[PDB]
Design an enzyme around this catalytic site. Structure first.
Site, PDB file in Angstrom:
ATOM      1  N   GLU A 127       0.828  -1.196   0.000  1.00 15.45           N
ATOM      2  CA  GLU A 127       0.000   0.000   0.000  1.00 15.45           C
ATOM      3  C   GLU A 127       0.865   1.250   0.000  1.00 15.45           C
ATOM      4  O   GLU A 127       1.865   1.334   0.720  1.00 15.45           O
ATOM      5  CB  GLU A 127      -0.924   0.037   1.218  1.00 15.45           C
ATOM      6  CG  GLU A 127      -1.813   1.282   1.263  1.00 15.45           C
ATOM      7  CD  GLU A 127      -2.718   1.326   2.478  1.00 15.45           C
ATOM      8  OE1 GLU A 127      -2.551   0.485   3.383  1.00 15.45           O
ATOM      9  OE2 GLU A 127      -3.595   2.218   2.536  1.00 15.45           O
ATOM     10  N   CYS A 158      16.363  23.804  17.440  1.00 15.68           N
ATOM     11  CA  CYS A 158      17.626  24.526  17.460  1.00 15.68           C
ATOM     12  C   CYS A 158      18.726  23.537  17.798  1.00 15.68           C
ATOM     13  O   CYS A 158      18.451  22.409  18.228  1.00 15.68           O
ATOM     14  CB  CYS A 158      17.613  25.677  18.470  1.00 15.68           C
ATOM     15  SG  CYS A 158      17.802  25.152  20.170  1.00 15.68           S
ATOM     16  N   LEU A 161       0.309   4.292   7.958  1.00 17.03           N
ATOM     17  CA  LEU A 161       0.965   4.947   6.836  1.00 17.03           C
ATOM     18  C   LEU A 161       1.965   5.958   7.383  1.00 17.03           C
ATOM     19  O   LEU A 161       1.572   6.919   8.053  1.00 17.03           O
ATOM     20  CB  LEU A 161      -0.063   5.620   5.930  1.00 17.03           C
ATOM     21  CG  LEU A 161      -0.845   4.626   5.069  1.00 17.03           C
ATOM     22  CD1 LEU A 161      -2.191   5.195   4.665  1.00 17.03           C
ATOM     23  CD2 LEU A 161      -0.040   4.240   3.840  1.00 17.03           C
ATOM     24  N   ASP A 207       8.279   6.514  15.433  1.00 16.45           N
ATOM     25  CA  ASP A 207       8.274   7.947  15.166  1.00 16.45           C
ATOM     26  C   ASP A 207       8.601   8.684  16.454  1.00 16.45           C
ATOM     27  O   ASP A 207       7.851   8.585  17.431  1.00 16.45           O
ATOM     28  CB  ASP A 207       6.916   8.396  14.621  1.00 16.45           C
ATOM     29  CG  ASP A 207       6.923   9.841  14.157  1.00 16.45           C
ATOM     30  OD1 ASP A 207       7.874  10.576  14.494  1.00 16.45           O
ATOM     31  OD2 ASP A 207       5.972  10.243  13.455  1.00 16.45           O
ATOM     32  N   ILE A 208       9.708   9.422  16.459  1.00 19.96           N
ATOM     33  CA  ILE A 208      10.086  10.269  17.581  1.00 19.96           C
ATOM     34  C   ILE A 208       9.969  11.709  17.113  1.00 19.96           C
ATOM     35  O   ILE A 208      10.593  12.101  16.119  1.00 19.96           O
ATOM     36  CB  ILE A 208      11.503   9.961  18.083  1.00 19.96           C
ATOM     37  CG1 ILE A 208      11.782   8.462  17.998  1.00 19.96           C
ATOM     38  CG2 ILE A 208      11.669  10.449  19.509  1.00 19.96           C
ATOM     39  CD1 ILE A 208      13.118   8.063  18.577  1.00 19.96           C
ATOM     40  N   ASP A 209       9.167  12.492  17.828  1.00 21.30           N
ATOM     41  CA  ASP A 209       8.763  13.829  17.419  1.00 21.30           C
ATOM     42  C   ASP A 209       9.113  14.819  18.515  1.00 21.30           C
ATOM     43  O   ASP A 209       8.708  14.642  19.669  1.00 21.30           O
ATOM     44  CB  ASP A 209       7.258  13.884  17.128  1.00 21.30           C
ATOM     45  CG  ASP A 209       6.942  13.826  15.646  1.00 21.30           C
ATOM     46  OD1 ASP A 209       7.750  14.335  14.840  1.00 21.30           O
ATOM     47  OD2 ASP A 209       5.885  13.271  15.286  1.00 21.30           O
ATOM     48  N   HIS A 235      12.323   9.072  12.139  1.00 23.12           N
ATOM     49  CA  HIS A 235      11.629   7.804  12.020  1.00 23.12           C
ATOM     50  C   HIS A 235      12.675   6.698  11.968  1.00 23.12           C
ATOM     51  O   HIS A 235      13.811   6.918  11.544  1.00 23.12           O
ATOM     52  CB  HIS A 235      10.745   7.781  10.777  1.00 23.12           C
ATOM     53  CG  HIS A 235       9.689   8.839  10.780  1.00 23.12           C
ATOM     54  ND1 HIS A 235       9.018   9.226   9.640  1.00 23.12           N
ATOM     55  CD2 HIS A 235       9.196   9.600  11.784  1.00 23.12           C
ATOM     56  CE1 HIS A 235       8.149  10.173   9.944  1.00 23.12           C
ATOM     57  NE2 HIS A 235       8.238  10.420  11.238  1.00 23.12           N
ATOM     58  N   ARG A 270      10.541  17.942  12.663  1.00 25.26           N
ATOM     59  CA  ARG A 270      10.479  17.859  14.113  1.00 25.26           C
ATOM     60  C   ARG A 270      11.108  16.610  14.705  1.00 25.26           C
ATOM     61  O   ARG A 270      11.176  16.510  15.933  1.00 25.26           O
ATOM     62  CB  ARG A 270       9.019  17.946  14.577  1.00 25.26           C
ATOM     63  CG  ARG A 270       8.457  19.360  14.571  1.00 25.26           C
ATOM     64  CD  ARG A 270       6.978  19.368  14.230  1.00 25.26           C
ATOM     65  NE  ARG A 270       6.252  18.317  14.930  1.00 25.26           N
ATOM     66  CZ  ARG A 270       5.058  17.859  14.575  1.00 25.26           C
ATOM     67  NH1 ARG A 270       4.415  18.344  13.524  1.00 25.26           N
ATOM     68  NH2 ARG A 270       4.493  16.891  15.293  1.00 25.26           N
ATOM     69  N   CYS A 301      14.477  25.713  25.151  1.00 21.24           N
ATOM     70  CA  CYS A 301      15.038  26.561  24.106  1.00 21.24           C
ATOM     71  C   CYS A 301      14.001  26.915  23.047  1.00 21.24           C
ATOM     72  O   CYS A 301      13.986  28.040  22.539  1.00 21.24           O
ATOM     73  CB  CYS A 301      16.230  25.873  23.455  1.00 21.24           C
ATOM     74  SG  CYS A 301      15.891  24.179  23.014  1.00 21.24           S
TER      75      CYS A 301
HETATM   76 ZN    ZN Z   1      15.929  24.288  20.739  1.00 22.30          ZN
END
Ligand code: ZN
Lengths: 381, 128
Positions: free
Chosen positions: A41, A125, A306, A106-108, A163, A160, A118
């Site tokens: 898919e 940053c 997905l 997924d790490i965001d 994966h 951000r 910050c």
């Molecule tokens: Zn920062």
């Protein structure tokens, strides 16, 4: 980068830069299993946020064609189903089942907002990226040591976070329950915005947690005590005080009134906690609450999920979702990642080797090495 | 059948249990002593409430992590290279699962091979 310029550049990229050959090598997995690529898919997001799924293709030529025709803004890879998704309408109800898919994480950065100072929301940053740098090491080590997954592709998400695609044949046949078990095993920081203490380790430290704390320690002084300065002023160190029992809180406050550097304050906190023994793990709980990765179990549990395709173009930053070399992780810079505009400028400045003339080349090289390892595993086996 | 099997398993001494798990190629571990010493500290910190000497008196088993879901999920058993190291109640469950699968398949096949037996009048009054 001008996002109004996105519709101008997307075709050229999809025509002369998107690495279709290696992409098919990946998703075809050496042709061993028949209909493997044909039952995969895909989903496309086109202009004006038009979403389509149950897209499947016969081979590389069909994919190249329909993609160059549609010029999608987003490409997501999904499961390999029992039949071809394109004909899901033709399959008798209940007989259309997702059967295999890579194990994905997924790490965001947005999920770290309550613990970084910050930036906020979608801002990143150099001072906060070290968190991702920690995650990749903490998680990937587990995946290479505790579970024995051997083919792991880490990809920048474009803005951000990152994966991970774990593509071992064993990892692709894992049921939903096994995936949920894997996710929960790797997951430590549990709780929402309404909970203050999100880590409560037992008296016995499970070896995995010991190795994650060992990995954290190497970076903690730079990330938390130098860069983040989690003890800069009262408004921030009040949180860390809020994360430890009240009994010593007062004792700490006066000490924090006589400290000039957050490294000094950390030394003082460690000494006070050591003096105070069941709480001997409290500093570790604080380190984890500020450094351990957060995982959305819903992303990794479901087979039908997905996820953003590698070498996609981020609709807003324009950066390419490029693979990250594990060895050179410490040198990775999410701000130097090629944007689509830069690589179209590079393309219009000079057939199967055009991409070698752009700044995209080393990332396709890392992807090619990963695919070479997968091919070696498919053969040797 | 499952009930009976469960009962019988419940009456098996650990030695006998391992013997069974070997004879049927279930290959649920058994780790060597040398490997046990190799991962002594990891094993000690893996199993809850296991003492040093008492741990020295115990032998573990190596199982694919797909079978120890209920143990791995709350992180109460060490995982190394895709195998969990499980000490000597839940295992019967996995065994039973396997058994049930097999038995169902067998019953299907038997129902497929019924016409050959119906012709034997001697056994028809009984089986029917
Ligand atoms: Zn920062």
């Amino acid at each position: 980068y001008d996002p109004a310029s996105l519709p101008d550049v997307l075709p050229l990229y999809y025509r002369r830069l998107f690495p279709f050959y290696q992409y098919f090598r990946w998703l075809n997995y050496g042709g061993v299993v028949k209909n493997y690529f044909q039952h995969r898919e895909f989903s496309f997001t086109l202009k004006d946020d038009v979403y389509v799924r149950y897209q499947s293709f016969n081979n590389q030529s069909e994919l190249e064609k329909e993609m160059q025709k549609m010029c999608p803004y987003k490409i997501d890879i999904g499961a390999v189903y029992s039949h071809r998704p394109s004909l899901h309408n033709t399959v008798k109800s209940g007989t259309f089942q997702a059967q295999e898919k890579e194990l994905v994480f997924d790490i965001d950065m947005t999920d770290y907002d309550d613990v970084r100072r910050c930036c906020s929301s979608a801002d990143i940053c150099p001072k906060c990226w070290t968190l991702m740098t920690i995650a990749v090491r903490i998680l990937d080590r587990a995946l290479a040591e505790d579970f024995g997954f051997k083919h792991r592709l880490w990809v920048y998400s474009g803005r951000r976070g990152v994966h991970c695609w774990v593509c071992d044949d064993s990892a692709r046949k894992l049921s939903q329950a096994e995936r949920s078990a894997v996710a929960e095993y790797l997951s430590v920081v549990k709780g929402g915005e309404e909970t203050i203490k999100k880590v409560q380790l037992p008296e016995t430290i499970h070896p995995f947690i010991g190795k994650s704390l060992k990995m954290v320690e190497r970076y903690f002084e730079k990330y938390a005590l130098v860069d983040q300065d989690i003890l800069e002023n009262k408004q921030c160190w009040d949180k860390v005080i809020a994360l430890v029992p009240e009994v010593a809180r007062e004792s700490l406050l006066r000490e924090f009134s006589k400290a000039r550097s957050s490294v000094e304050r950390w030394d003082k906190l460690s000494s006070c906690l050591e003096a105070t023994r069941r709480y001997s793990n409290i500093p570790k709980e604080i380190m984890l609450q500020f450094c351990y990765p957060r995982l959305d179990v819903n992303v990794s549990k479901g087979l039908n999920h997905l996820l953003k395709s590698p070498f996609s173009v981020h609709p807003k930053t324009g950066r390419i979702s490029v693979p990250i070399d594990c060895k050179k992780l410490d040198q990775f810079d999410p701000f130097s990642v090629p944007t689509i505009s830069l690589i179209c400028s590079e393309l219009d400045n000079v057939r199967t080797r055009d991409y070698k003339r752009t700044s995209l080349a080393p990332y396709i090289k890392v992807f090619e090495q990963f695919l070479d390892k997968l091919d070696q595993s498919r053969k040797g086996e | 059948e499952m009930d009976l099997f469960k009962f019988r398993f419940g009456l098996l001494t650990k030695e006998s249990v391992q013997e069974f798990l070997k004879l049927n190629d279930l290959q649920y571990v058994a780790i060597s002593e040398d490997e046990k010493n190799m991962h002594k500290e990891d094993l000690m910190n893996s199993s809850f409430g296991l003492s040093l000497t008492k741990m020295e008196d115990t032998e573990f088993y190596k199982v694919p992590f797909q079978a120890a879901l209920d143990l791995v999920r709350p992180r109460k058993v060490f995982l190394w290279r895709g195998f969990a190291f499980i000490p000597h109640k839940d295992i019967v469950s996995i065994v039973l699962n396997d058994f049930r699968a097999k038995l169902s398949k067998a019953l299907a096949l038997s129902a497929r091979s019924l016409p050959v037996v119906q012709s034997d009048e001697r056994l028809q009054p009984l089986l029917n």
